[PDB]
Amino acid sequence: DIQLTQSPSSLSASVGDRVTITCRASQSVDYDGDSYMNWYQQKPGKAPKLLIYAASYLESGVPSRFSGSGSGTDFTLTISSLQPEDFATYYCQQSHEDPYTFGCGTKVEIKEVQLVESGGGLVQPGGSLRLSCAVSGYSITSGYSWNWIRQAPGKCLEWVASITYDGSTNYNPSVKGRITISRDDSKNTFYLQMNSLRAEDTAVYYCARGSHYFGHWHFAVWGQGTLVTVSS
């Protein structure tokens, strides 16, 4: 399990300043001359947004003031000139091998396809949950893979499960045995079934689509997230 160390964990800067964030990986994420490191931006209340994939490639629509660099175990995200709209939390993520892992984020404080989750709510410990991600504006059969990713309260992002276009499923060993992912083409929906829930399963659960390119396991499209609360 590749672990990612993000530094600093938070920082204050002024508009117009250069900002640099570093990500250290506990193991190389290089493969065939490329580095499978990705950067996301998350504003409060919203799902993460993909900024960078394969260490240095800009996602479409991302402003040129964002740049990524590095290789091996050592990676950097640079904002050349901080703008007001850049106050957010920034996450690195490796897509070199499963389980795909995220850093715990850098909070930067200053001075068409749509995915809709349902099925969350308050459950008792030991109970079960079923989440659905309805895909609209896009055929579920067109996607390379569909994923569930959860965000524990005030904590790091955790990839949980995936199903590819050929039906192959994959789970994070942190949850495996209590979790099933499934797909329904005729309803353009996929599902997460959760059983024997524990308190550490309390989180916002996101659905997200994988990519056909550049190692697949970075996530350009996310749902709104649904809150699962396991309490008494």
Numbering used by the authors: 1 to 111, 1001 to 1121
Task: Reproduce, without paraphrasing, sentences from the article in which this PDB structure was first reported.
Immunoglobulin E (IgE) plays a central role in the allergic response, in which cross-linking of allergen by Fc∊RI-bound IgE triggers mast cell and basophil degranulation and the release of inflammatory mediators. Omalizumab is a clinically approved anti-IgE monoclonal antibody that binds to free IgE, also with high affinity, preventing its interaction with Fc∊RI. Instead, the Fab alone selectively crystallized in different crystal forms, but their structures revealed intermolecular Fab/Fab interactions that were clearly strong enough to disrupt the Fab/IgE-Fc complexes.
We also attempted to crystallize the complex between a single-chain form of omalizumab (scFvXol) and IgE-Fc, but were unsuccessful. However, we solved the crystal structure of scFvXol alone, in which the light- and heavy-chain variable domains are connected by a (Gly4Ser)4 linker, to 2.3 Å resolution. The scFvXol structure contains one molecule in the asymmetric unit. However, CDRH1–3 residues from a symmetry-related molecule contact the VL domain of scFvXol in a similar manner to the first interface described for the FabXol1 and FabXol2 structures, although the interface area is reduced from ∼395 to ∼290 Å2 due to the absence of the Cκ domain in scFvXol.
